[PDB]
Amino acid sequence: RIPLWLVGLVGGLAVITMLSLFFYGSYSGLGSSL
Amino acid sequence: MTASLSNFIASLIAGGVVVGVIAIALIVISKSDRILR
Amino acid sequence: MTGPNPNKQAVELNRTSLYWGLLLIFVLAVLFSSYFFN
Amino acid sequence: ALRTRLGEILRPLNAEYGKVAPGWGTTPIMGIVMLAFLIFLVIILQIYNSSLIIENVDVDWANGIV
Amino acid sequence: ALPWYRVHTVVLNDPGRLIAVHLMHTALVAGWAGSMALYELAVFDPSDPVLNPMWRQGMFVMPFMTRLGITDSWGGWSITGESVSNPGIWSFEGVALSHIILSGMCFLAAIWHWVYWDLELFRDPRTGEPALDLPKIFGIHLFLSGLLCFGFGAFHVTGLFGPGIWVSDAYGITGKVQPVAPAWGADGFNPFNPGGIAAHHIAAGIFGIFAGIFHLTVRPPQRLYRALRMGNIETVLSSSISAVFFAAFVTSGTMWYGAAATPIELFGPTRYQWDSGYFQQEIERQVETSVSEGLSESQAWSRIPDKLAFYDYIGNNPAKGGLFRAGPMNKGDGIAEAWLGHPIFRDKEGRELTVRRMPAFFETFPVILVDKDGIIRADIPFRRAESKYSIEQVGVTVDFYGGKLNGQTFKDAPTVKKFARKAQLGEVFEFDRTSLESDGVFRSSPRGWYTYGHANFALLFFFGHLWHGGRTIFRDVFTGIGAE
Amino acid sequence: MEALVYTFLLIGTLMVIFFAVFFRETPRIL
Amino acid sequence: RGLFDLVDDWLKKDRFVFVGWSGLLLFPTAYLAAGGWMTGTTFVTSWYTHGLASSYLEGCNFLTAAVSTPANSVGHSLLLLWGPEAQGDFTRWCQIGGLWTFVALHGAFGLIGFCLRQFEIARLVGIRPYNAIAFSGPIAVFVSVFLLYPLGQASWFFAPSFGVAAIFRFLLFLQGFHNWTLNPFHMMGVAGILGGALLCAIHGATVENTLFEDGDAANTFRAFTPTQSEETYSMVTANRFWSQIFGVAFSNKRWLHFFMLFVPVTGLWTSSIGIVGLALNLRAYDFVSQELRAAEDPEFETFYTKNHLLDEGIRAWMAAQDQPHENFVFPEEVLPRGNAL
Amino acid sequence: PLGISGTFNFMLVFQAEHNILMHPFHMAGVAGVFGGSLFSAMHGSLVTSSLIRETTENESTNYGYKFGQEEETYNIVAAHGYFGRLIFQYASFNNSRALHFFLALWPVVGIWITSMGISTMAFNLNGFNFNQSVVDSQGRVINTWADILNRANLGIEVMHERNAHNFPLDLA
Amino acid sequence: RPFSDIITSVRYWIIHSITIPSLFVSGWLFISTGLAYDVFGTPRPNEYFTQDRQQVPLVNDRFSAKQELEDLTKG
Amino acid sequence: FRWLAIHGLAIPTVFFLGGITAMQFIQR
Amino acid sequence: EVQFGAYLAVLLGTFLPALFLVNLFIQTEARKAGKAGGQDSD
Amino acid sequence: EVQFGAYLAVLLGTFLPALFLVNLFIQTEARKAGKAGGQDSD
Ligand code: CLA
Ligand code: CLA
Ligand code: CLA
Ligand SMILES: CCCCCCCCCCCCCCCC(=O)OC[C@H](COP(=O)(O)OC[C@@H](O)CO)OC(=O)CCCCCCCCCCCCCCC
Ligand SMILES: CC1=C(/C=C/C(C)=C/C=C/C(C)=C/C=C/C=C(C)/C=C/C=C(C)/C=C/C2=C(C)CCCC2(C)C)C(C)(C)CCC1
Ligand SMILES: CC1=C(/C=C/C(C)=C/C=C/C(C)=C/C=C/C=C(C)/C=C/C=C(C)/C=C/C2=C(C)CCCC2(C)C)C(C)(C)CCC1
Ligand code: OEX
Ligand SMILES: [Fe+2]
């Protein structure tokens, strides 16, 4: 048994590591106009 | 008999097995999951 | 002739649905006039 | 309920109403026709679309005989 | 207590007045086609069927009479131009007057069939309630349409007992009503083959004869009589509409893309004959063979008919008109008079410059002169200050060949700019814009209007398939649903 | 001559707005 | 009993997702339209068809990625995977733009299969089928734009590509070349979309502000059990409110909720009729009485003639890069510029 | 401009000078009125689907509602079980109050956000600009859909107020 | 079984602690090994332009479109 | 069983997100 | 220059359908006054 | 050359008064069907 709010916490900050990774590569790599 | 006509009948056979493997799988599972009277 | 039809009904239109249908025609007349006059 | 002379002739055509063939009947015969007519419409569309090329059939304005 | 949108549902349980209504729609359709064709003969002018055909004069139903074999009129003129002493009964006036007489008789029959609604024919002999045996009514009415299909293709079309179909050549020069022998092979499904039309209505008429022989004798199954609700009459209407917009996408399709059933001598050219350069490449091909047979250039362009260059004109494209502008195409720029010729542009260096042509999208298009390899050599500049490719610099001279400007050469910039602007519009013609008060914007051909109505209709009838269809299946719950 | 039709359509539309507000069929309980 | 009855009873069984008969048409075709879009916007380029970049491999974000329409040389080919163009190769099928017709065709049979889903569930639950008839609205916008609009045009190239900014150019391509905003069918469509958003914002805010006291809590969301027969808001009050604010008001809940169906859906049907009229280039481009006057009088200016000069800028400036197949090489001196811009 | 053609002179010139379509607040209100007209016709259909029999087939459907009645005029359990099978079970509001609140939330929040798109673009804080954003390793500009959208904006920018400008940049 | 009772269970996270990283890394290796450029034919950043072909490549034929893309993708 | 219903949508989604995180670190 | 068939389009597009909808209202109120039996039925 | 305001004179001189006289007949028959009380009164 795992508390449900721990599950939404770890997956919720996992999405932030996915989203902010996508806004990172808007300023670096391809499609960055550097 | 052309390139275009031979490839189309092969797609018609391929269009038969796509309907087929859906239908054959659907008859078998409809036997097992019948509803009690 | 033959007998009276048992499928006679009556038509209704209340005062509410009059103003819808009037305003429907005038607004379509305002909209489509400018194109018809060209 | 007014007998007319033309009404007497056509009366056996309307005298049946709602007789059915019991069971599934000729339904599997119909579907083989409908599967066939589905293939027919696919073929004559792809001839027209030039996505099914038949030898000595060219979809272009042809010299009709004058 | 009916609402205004349910007033015509008193005919649901009344077969005797179902006919009198369906005869009255027929008396209005037939009275339209008679009175439309009488209106078109007061407007038509058979002065020049080469530069003023029937599709320039906005004739809509008139290319449907000439498609199935009507060329003469009681005035003595003909669309083929050959004179006639007597067209008999079936001329343009004879057809128009006979669709009127048919309208007046379907009118009087609908007064009978409305008054005498109570006939024993429509009663059930087992219950007494008014019923229609919809499986056998379909057997009769499909067997009749097998005969009128097979009878049409075998007798009217093939010229056994009929005139035949309007056929034509590939480039819309020659065309005449003639019998068409059917093509039974895979070449019948070439839609530009007129033999496929004869082979269709002969073959598919037989299938419609012997389907009515089936659908008379064999009764429906118990499952399909309940599943498709064949006791209800609205399942006929739900599925008849599906067989009617489906037919209307096809006819609007083959009108717009072209078929042998839509000749470009009657409805006008398609837009795909402008996009591919279908007439530009053909006029050059009849000059490439003329010049190769030892000719001067102006004698080569003089062999080109005025009709062939008239299709090479952007004002005959149906994709140039507008919606709320009205009238014939002659209202566009006037009745054409003559062909001004084929201008050929040459610079001071002497190379040949072709004017870049306007596509069908562009209402406005800048005049650009391009040589053979694609390099921009001259134009008419918007901004005249920093000009590097103007006609004054390049020194473009114009040379006409054929037409009424046959051997002429204009060399100055005022005159060359006037012919460079009118050469991006296809060929160059002299019009008569004072007869019909022609304003100066392009209209559409009857090819364009037919595709408009019968494809906006077919989209609306798709909603009628879903309304009347879902009204058939769900019939027990249209007062509402039960709370239990 | 042309703008006379446009004005008649506009003030004619404002008439049926006036009659719909003040001469409305007043709904009543029971 | 029979074989048909066992299959009919299995599909209609209560389960997680209702399958039914219509799920055999929906679930295969909708899964491949959606997955064909996610693949085509991620991996497949537009470098050979349009000469663009429309993938995530090519640096485009969510906005500038698309599944793009094929070349003009393809014409209106269906671009079958086994066809004469692709000839069985998957890689050359993607580069021609074969995924776009794959998305549009399997998507068109998803909207068929989803509208059949709404007739099937309504017959089992036992209700009137107005969801399936209101969903016919969005069917008339998919068909008459993604299908019937490129059919009337030169090829599939002039269709909306399935991407966010690729719709946005289709909005701009349709003003300069067609004058779409002048068309009365868009004008009756904006009246239904902004009219439909109006009705749910009012009916949302009037039900929620005439609620009854059914509890002592300050939260009013808690005080509603779903199976209760008492109405949850005072219709007499809400009528009395709007009869004095706006002047006229609904006195009929059956007429109200039907009117919330009619207004959004009709704006999708009337706007769908006009876009069929632009497949044929029957556009409402000009008022000729405005155009004949502005030609003879070089002082008469309206807002309407100001929009034509904005459309010459759309027809000239983008059409060089819009249509690389036609090879428009415009000089600098033909492009209409204004003063000092 | 207070008119109809003046509105589209306003919208197109606002596109060239501010790039509203790429701005995420016009994006959040297109979602407000497409969503608003969705949930309007989605709520208005599920009430009209589940009406209770109170009329005959001859008279109108609407006359089964007497004004000011206290009985509920539609089976709300029926329309909940329909939409509970049309998508799945847990996506359906059984609460009619929370349902009639979501109809008021979605458009109004979508138009608050949109009207503060025009406001923040009144002070020349324009929408996104992805022009010349994709380059190869050589450095040549690879076009995107935003570059095609840019050439539509450049056509309106060089043509709006074709006489009012004297200097190379439309600062106003 | 209810959905929230699944993801809170340990046996769920026993299975999906192996399958998620074994499937996310396979989506990484699908790109970093250069495989996605060859299945879908997407140009690498090296190969939008070539030494010979300096213009924008377009398909200009209905039926030999497969053969023309064999031309424009070799160099 | 519903393991075929979710994992037809989730097994692709994690696979593509494995590729979209890899494309952030690809440069010229 | 305007099209002179547009006056016939608009002014019959107004009047003919709008005079139709008036008739369905007048006979509606006549049936209600017809059944009511007082001073107006006749 | 004819006067283009005469089409509006004639076709409204026909239709507007003739559609008026139809309305007085339809509400006449509705009052007679209103009092009669059978199948059409409502
Ligand atoms: C084959 C054609 C056909 C036929 C025979 C019917 C027959 C019927 N329909 Mg149906 N329908 C059709 C097509 C057809 N429909 C199409 C295409 C649609 C989609 C638009 C509909 C949508 C529809 C709805 C939504 C409803 C019906 C209803 C009805 C029934 C009564 C009609 C009525 O009271 O209208 C009476 C109409 C009037 C008094 C005036 C209508 C005025 C129109 C809008 C403008 C004038 C018409 C114009 C002159 C026509 C030009 C010709 C053009 C068609 C080419 C009747 C069974 C009703 C029903 O279900 O019955 C209970 C109903 O509610 N139909
Ligand atoms: C000797 C054999 C023979 C021959 C040579 C023909 C010859 C022909 N038949 Mg025919 N036919 C025959 C026997 C024959 N028939 C028999 C035995 C039957 C059974 C009764 C038919 C039934 C039949 C039908 C039903 C049709 C033909 C058609 C045709 C024409 C095909 C070329 C063409 O223009 O189609 C063009 C091809 C199509 C139009 C394909 C139809 C597919 C539809 C349009 C798809 C779209 C449907 C959808 C609702 C539209 C909206 C979606 C939108 C987004 C696109 C040609 C005249 C077609 C025709 O008359 O068109 C002029 C046609 O529609 N035939
Ligand atoms: C007595 C018979 C008769 C004859 C010989 C004609 C003759 C003519 N009519 Mg006319 N007409 C008639 C009766 C007749 N009319 C009646 C009774 C009406 C009222 C409904 C009309 C209404 C009418 C109109 C509105 C028009 C004509 C027109 C024409 C002319 C061209 C016909 C044409 O292109 O149609 C082409 C016909 C079709 C394309 C019909 C196709 C049938 C569909 C595809 C059937 C498909 C379903 C099928 C049943 C399924 C089963 C198939 C089975 C075999 C397998 C021609 C002179 C045209 C004209 O120029 O008028 C002056 C025109 O526009 N007619
Ligand atoms: C200073 C502020 C004072 C208030 C200002 C008043 C303006 C109010 C406008 C009146 C609406 C009249 C339309 C009649 C309509 C009519 O009478 O309907 C009456 C109808 C009442 O329906 P019931 O529930 O009575 O109907 C039950 C059944 O009988 C149905 O038939 O009320 C509504 O549904 C109207 C709600 C939508 C209101 C539609 C308004 C659309 C805006 C106007 C569009 C035209 C503007 C054109 C200008 C060129
Ligand atoms: C009685 C009689 C007679 C007579 C008859 C007649 C003379 C007829 C006529 C008829 C007619 C002459 C009719 C007509 C009709 C028409 C119609 C019916 C039309 C309509 C149309 C419509 C309505 C349309 C609409 C529209 C429009 C307008 C626009 C666009 C859209 C649409 C298309 C929708 C005779 C002597 C022979 C014989 C004896 C008896
Ligand atoms: C194409 C094709 C194919 C395939 C198909 C399929 C199988 C597909 C699938 C696919 C899929 C089906 C896909 C999916 C994708 C997904 C994605 C990739 C997603 C993403 C997501 C995101 C990114 C989002 C975000 C977010 C979050 C996470 C949270 C918060 C919110 C938001 C929204 C922001 C085949 C083989 C048939 C062949 C033919 C062609
Ligand atoms: O005023 Mn109205 O539009 Ca706003 O940008 Mn600057 O200013 Mn004028 O130019 Mn562009
Ligand atoms: Fe509600």
Residue by residue, what is the 3-state secondary structure of E98-109?
Answer: HHHHHHHHHHHH
Q: Does residue E89 have its Cβ closer than 6 Å to ligand 3? A: no
Burial of E136 (0-12, 13-18, 19+ CB in 10 A): buried
Nearest ligand to the C-alpha atom of residue H104: 8
Out of G24, G82, G84, the one facing B11 most closely (by C-beta) is G82
- Identify the three-state secondary structure at position E48: coil
Find chains touching chain L: ≥3 CB pairs under 8 Å: C, K
User: Is E381 close to ligand 1, i.e. is its CB under 6 Å away?
Assistant: no
Burial E228-254 (b: 16+ CB within 10 A, else e): ebbebbbbbbbeebbeebeebbebbbb
**Among K24, K26, K27, K31, the residue to mutate for chain C (most C Cβ within 10 A):** K24
* Cβ neighbours of residue C12 closer than 8 Å, sequence gap 6 or more: E1, E2, E3, H59, H60, K24, K28, K31, L42
Q: Which of C3-37 are b and which e, b meaning 16 or more Cβ less than 10 Å from the residue's Cβ?
A: eebeeebbbbbbebbbbebbeebbeebbebbbbbb
CA B13, distance to chain mean position in Å, is 9
DSSP single-letter state for residue E363: S
Interface of F with C in 1-30 (CB under 8 A): 2, 5-6, 9-10, 12-13, 16-17, 19-20, 23-25
In degrees and rounded to multiples of 5, residue E167 shows phi and psi of: -110, 175
Atom of ligand 2 at shortest range from CA of E251: 62
- What residue type is assigned to position E114 of the chain? W
Question: Do K13 and C25 make contact, defined as CB atoms within 8 angstroms?
Answer: yes
- Distance, CA of B33 to CA of G6 (rounded, Å): 9
Spell out the SS3 assignment of chain D: CCCCHHHHHHHHHHCCCCCCECCCCCHHHHHHHHHHHHHHHHHHHHHHCCCCCCCCCCCCCCCCCC
Q: Cβ of H58 under 8 Å from any chain C Cβ? A: yes
As a whole number of Å, the CA-based R_g of chain B is 16
Ligand with an atom nearest the CA of residue E7: 1
* Burial class for H32, CB neighbours closer than 10 Å (0-12, 13-18, 19+): buried
What's at E373, amino acid-wise? D
3-state secondary structure of E78: strand
Method of structure determination? cryo-EM
Spatial distance between the Cα atoms of B2 and B20, rounded to a whole number of angstroms: 27
CA L34 to chain centre: 19
The helix/strand/coil state of E370 is strand
Which chain H residue lies closest to E481 (C-alpha atoms)? H52
Tokens of G272: 């769908």
Cα gap D58→L38, rounded to integer Å? 69
**Which of F5, F9, F24 should be substituted to probe chain C, the one whose Cβ sees the most C Cβ atoms within 10 Å?**
F9
Contacts of residue J18, Cβ cutoff 8 Å, sequence gap at least 6: I23, I24, I25, I26, I27, I28, I30, I31
Torsions phi, psi of D62, nearest 5?
A: -100, 155
**Which residues are bridge partners to E167 per DSSP?**
E176
When computed from its CA atoms, the radius of gyration of chain G, rounded to whole angstroms, is 26
Gap between the Cα atoms of G283 and G306, Å rounded: 18
Question: Is residue H35 within 8 Å of residue H105, measured between CB atoms?
Answer: no
User: Resolution in A for the shown PDB structure?
Assistant: 3.3
Query: Nearest CA of chain G to the CA of I70: how many Å?
Result: 9
Of D50, D51, D53, the CB nearest to G80: D51
For the CA of C17, the nearest atom of ligand 4:
31
Task: Find the residue in F nearest to C36 (Cα).
Answer: F2
Strand runs (DSSP E) across chain F, as ranges? none
Q: Which chains reach chain H with 3 or more Cβ–Cβ distances below 8 angstroms?
A: A, C, E, F, G, I, J
Phi and psi at E27, nearest 5°, equal -70, -20
Strand G162-163 relative to strand G66-67: parallel, antiparallel, unpaired?
Answer: antiparallel
CB-based contacts of E430: which residues, under 8 Å, 6+ apart?
E336, E337, E338, E339, E340, E404
G306 contacts H152 by C-beta, under 8 angstroms: no
Q: Do I and C have ≥3 inter-chain CB pairs under 8 A?
A: no
The whole-angstrom separation of Cα E344 and Cα E427 is 11
| Phi (first) and psi of residue H27, to 5 degrees | -70, -30
Cα separation, E235 vs H45, in Å, equals 24
CA distance to partner chain D, nearest, from residue B25 (Å): 21
Those residues whose C-beta lies under 8 Å from the C-beta of residue G326, and which sit 6 or more positions away, are E359, G72
Ligand 1: residue whose CA is nearest its atom 2: E241
Chain C residues with beta carbon closer than 8 angstroms to that of L41: 10
Which of A15, A20, A30 should one mutate to test binding to chain J, selecting the residue with the greatest count of J CBs within 10 A? A30
Terminal-residue alpha carbon distance, chain F = 52
Of the residues E107, E454, E456, which should be mutated to test ligand 5's pocket, given the most ligand atoms within 8 Å of the CB?
Answer: E107
Tokens of G233: 């808001």
Contact call for I46 and H142, based on CB within 8 A: no
CA of E52 to the centre of ligand 3 (A): 27
Phi-psi region of A33 (alpha: psi -120 to 50; beta: other; left: phi over 0): left
Backbone angles phi, psi at E377, to 5 degrees: -105, -35
CB-facing half-sphere around the CA of G61: CA atoms within 13 A: 21
Beta carbons of E269 and E315 less than 8 angstroms apart: no
The response to whether residue E247 sits with its C-beta less than 6 Å from ligand 2 reads no
What's G147's DSSP letter? I
User: Which protein residue's CA is at the shortest distance from atom 37 of ligand 6?
Assistant: G32
Contact C37, K11 (CB under 8 A): no
**Contact assessment for residue I36 and residue I30, using Cβ atoms and an 8 Å cutoff:** yes
- Give the residue whose CA is nearest to atom 6 of ligand 6: G35
**Is G216 in contact with G316 (CB distance < 8 Å)?**
no
Contact H35, H68 (CB under 8 A): no
Q: What six digits make up the tokens of E50?
A: 């080469």
Q: How far apart are the first and last CA of chain C?
A: 52
CA–CA min distance E174, chain H (Å): 46
> Taking CA H151 as the corner, what is the angle to CA H146 and CA H153, rounded to the nearest 5 degrees?
90
Strand positions, DSSP E, G158-251: 162-163
Alpha carbon G94 to chain centroid, angstroms: 25
How far is Cα G59 from Cα C20, in angstroms, rounded to an integer?
53
Rounded CA-CA distance E145/G260 in Å is 45
Chains that touch B (3 or more CB pairs under 8 A): D, G
| Residue H136 in contact with partner chain J when CB distance is under 8 A | yes
d(CA E250, CA E454): 10
CA–CA distances in Å: residue G286 to residues E444, G181, H115: 15, 12, 32
DSSP E430: E
Q: Which of residues 302-341 of E touch K (CB under 8 A)?
A: 326
Question: E356: which 2 tokens?
Answer: 């870049």
- G331 within 8 A of E388, measured Cβ to Cβ: yes
Asked whether E405 and E340 are in contact (CB, 8 A), the reply is: yes
Q: Which helix (H) or strand (E) covers residue E376, if one does?
A: strand E376-379
3-state secondary structure chain H: CCCCHHHHHHHHHHHHHHCCCCCHHHHHHHHHHHHHHHHHHHHHHHHHHCEECCCCCCCCHHHHCCCCCCECCECHHHHHHHHHHHCCCCCCCCCHHHHHHHHHHHHHHHHHHHHHHHCCCCCCCCCCCCCCCEECCCCCEECCHHHHHHHHHHHHHCCCCCCCCCCCCCCC
Nearest to H146 by CA among H54, H14, H19: H19
User: Could you tell me if D13 and E133 are in contact, meaning their C-beta atoms sit under 8 angstroms apart?
Assistant: yes
Whose CA is closest to I72, among G102, G166, G45?
G45
Interface test with H, best of G45, G310, G334 (most H CBs within 10 A): G310
Q: How many CA atoms lie within 13 A of G224 on its CB side?
A: 20
Q: Which stretch of DSSP H or E encloses residue E377?
A: strand E376-379
Nearest CB to I62 within list G48, G57, G75: G75
Residues from chain H that touch C9, judged by Cβ atoms under 8 A, are 58
Using an 8 Å CB-CB cutoff, list chain K residues near E4. 24
Query: Neighbouring chains of F at 3+ CB pairs within 8 Å?
Result: C, G, H, K
CA-CA distances (angstroms) from residue F29 to G235, H55, H65? 11, 19, 11
Is residue G9 within 8 A of residue G21, CB to CB? The reply is no
Question: Are G231 and H72 spatial neighbours (Cβ–Cβ below 8 Å)?
Answer: yes
Encoded tokens for G120: 């099937």
Q: For D3-12, give one letter per residue: b (16+ CB within 10 A) or e.
A: eeeeeeeeee
